[PDB]
Amino acid sequence: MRGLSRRVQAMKPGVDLVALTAGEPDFDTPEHVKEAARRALAQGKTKYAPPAGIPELREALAEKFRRENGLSVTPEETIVTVGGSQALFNLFQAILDPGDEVIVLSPYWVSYPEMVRFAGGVVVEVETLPEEGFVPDPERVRRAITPRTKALVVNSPNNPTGAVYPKEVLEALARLAVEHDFYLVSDEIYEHLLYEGEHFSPGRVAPEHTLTVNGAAKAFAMTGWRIGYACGPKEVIKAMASVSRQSTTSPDTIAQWATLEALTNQEASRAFVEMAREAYRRRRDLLLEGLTALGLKAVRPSGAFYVLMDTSPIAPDEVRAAERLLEAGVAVVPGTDFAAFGHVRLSYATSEENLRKALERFARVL
Amino acid sequence: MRGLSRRVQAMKPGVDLVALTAGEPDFDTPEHVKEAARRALAQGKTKYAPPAGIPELREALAEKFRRENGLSVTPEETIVTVGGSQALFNLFQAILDPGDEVIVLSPYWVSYPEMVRFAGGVVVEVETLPEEGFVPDPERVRRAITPRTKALVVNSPNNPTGAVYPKEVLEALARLAVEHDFYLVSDEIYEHLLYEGEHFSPGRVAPEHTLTVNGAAKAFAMTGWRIGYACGPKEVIKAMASVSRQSTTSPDTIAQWATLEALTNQEASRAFVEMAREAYRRRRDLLLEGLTALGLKAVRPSGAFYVLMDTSPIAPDEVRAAERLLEAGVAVVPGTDFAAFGHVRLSYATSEENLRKALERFARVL
Ligand SMILES: *Cc1c(COP(=O)(O)O)cnc(C)c1O
Ligand SMILES: *Cc1c(COP(=O)(O)O)cnc(C)c1O
């Protein structure tokens, strides 16, 4: 018989426009990384790499996680994947049996529920409130815990809210994982795009319960390179490598060598990060002041490069709001898929010039 | 609770040695491809690409499948993946429900049964015979079809046997798919590594039943670049792209542009293919001559760069034979995992000098 599988069928799908929809940096990847790619090419590093990644990168990864995040991990508790998205996908395929529950915090990144469902898992949503700065209340999270809870996904700095969760909240969530015996999945890819506060990694207190996901995509403007990395309990990392072996085999070898340079040349990478960070902060401040002057509401973000804007004054719902803004000349992302109803996601990974235009057009819509 | 999933737990795991174990070309990727990669880097083509691949590549793919294989496909019935392995992985995830049966022809590439079972499928094995040159008998296949058959996997040129199936057998297999209504998965990555006969794509006789899987890996010495491609029914291709979107997002952008060059610069690419084909042919003959002189049995391959050697004269079984050979100084791959019992896979993707060195050491295990 022909026909698609159930898992795949259950899956969810001359005008001048100013686009504020980007999910990737506007900067190009820094030259030290590009140069390392060039050396790898000339050195013929074009062969298959091990499923978990070239050993040199795994070693550098163990250093980064300990040095930057205070995580006590060995090279064997580290894995290189085809983007942070594959680290999350392999993780769910490795820990979820049909019916296992995963607590997700809304608004959430679009891919989380999809990946959980694709593995046969059940999504259990816990909402974070705009009035609480989109920071989870551990008390609301406890109520979502059942005997079937397998994992809890935390994403700070957050996409799409831009919220940075305080260490006390993160410690409280790590404690629930330990007390109730489940995995804490910490998506930390925006760690370096932080304007205020500190980036705390829950793996610092509960390493055997925490799976830390990260990558080069957002920090080093390497979205198209497809290199992500994770660390955590040795047995889970081993299982994740098994999934890669039977799907992608291993990430692009040239990209792995280029990523090694981003991690080892701390001086050049630090210079890129500080430059981008300062640019993003100026853009964020520019946007927020403008929105406030218009009377539009948005919780001030402390990280990433997104702003969730309440659309109540523009239309009855976020899709109608998004279509009106489109007519006005501004492309925004409706909050529907992120479970951010009544909001629209704005991205400031564009020029100040474009942010000014967009504010002019919002003005006209009001 | 914590713990690994069943699908992951069910998964199967001073000496001078000459290695005849390679599953990739010894040649480095051609300069024109490397140059295309440098241009993309210089041009800032480092951003996210669409889930099915950059439009330029999907169009070049349509041309390739039409031109080289006589397949009539549009760019939309084309998909780019992270290696041909991901094409197969996404395919099974997109077409298999737990319990669905997939017919595989032994000896088979190690990854087929693992990919089938990971998606919940049941592996039904149909044996090909040494006496029949490892070419399948359509009758034996017919005898394996049940109401639960979802697909039949065919790989020609074959890994690990090196057999090239005649157009007439490929047509008979396609007909069974059309006759019994199931998918025909054609793994054609070794099409350009052919020494005698001609490559026939069964998608020509059963377009709506066939998924043609291919890639740049073996033909252009690009195993580490991780770029594969497939074509087939629009609805299946669309479903495969959906799997990519929630797992890898899209293959590395730099590698996609480099692959476009390998497909469009026909003059430089054919020069490489013909150069490699010539070298492989030399190495094959040399290896076969040597074995024959040693009194060792092996079926003469017409494609790829492998030879399945009968280990009867060496040890009771192929694992023991592989161990004796190791002591003798030659590393070979036991036929165990390919369901090629009593055999050992030899790869001639190495220099003639190494092949000569191995043949010399073979004298010690008689
Ligand atoms: C970008 C992103 C990732 C991973 O991106 P990759 O490009 O696959 O590395 C993971 N989580 C969030 C919230 C992201 O925004
Ligand atoms: C090498 C190979 C593939 C695909 O390899 P990729 O490196 O993932 O492109 C598929 N089938 C067979 C039989 C192979 O030998």
Side-chain angles (χ1 to χ4, degrees), chain A residues 182-213:
Chain A
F182 56 77
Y183 297 111
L184 187 282
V185 179
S186 189
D187 188 352
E188 309 180 12
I189 25 69
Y190 287 108
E191 77 174 312
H192 292 128
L193 312 242
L194 191 85
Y195 313 116
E196 52 280 308
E198 299 264 293
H199 175 70
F200 179 86
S201 296
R204 286 172 189 193
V205 297
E208 294 171 8
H209 287 77
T210 310
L211 278 150
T212 302
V213 179

Side-chain angles (χ1 to χ4, degrees), chain A residues 48, chain B residues 83-85 109 112 155 159 187 189-190 217-218 226:
Chain A
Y48 285 125
Chain B
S85 69
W109 186 45
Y112 295 154
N155 176 219
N159 175 353
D187 192 347
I189 18 74
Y190 291 107
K218 315 290 169 30
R226 314 304 306 123

Side-chain angles (χ1 to χ4, degrees), chain B residues 116-134:
Chain B
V116 168
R117 298 186 185 118
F118 195 83
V122 172
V123 174
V124 171
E125 183 191 317
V126 165
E127 188 183 333
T128 67
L129 305 159
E131 16 283 354
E132 286 165 36
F134 289 116

Side-chain angles (χ1 to χ4, degrees), chain A residues 307-347:
Chain A
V307 161
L308 261 200
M309 175 184 82
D310 187 320
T311 51
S312 289
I314 306 186
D317 63 80
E318 74 285 350
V319 182
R320 295 205 236 167
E323 279 151 31
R324 262 208 79 196
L325 289 179
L326 259 188
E327 295 292 343
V330 185
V332 305
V333 178
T336 322
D337 299 337
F338 304 88
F341 304 110
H343 293 77
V344 116
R345 194 194 71 183
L346 304 187
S347 142

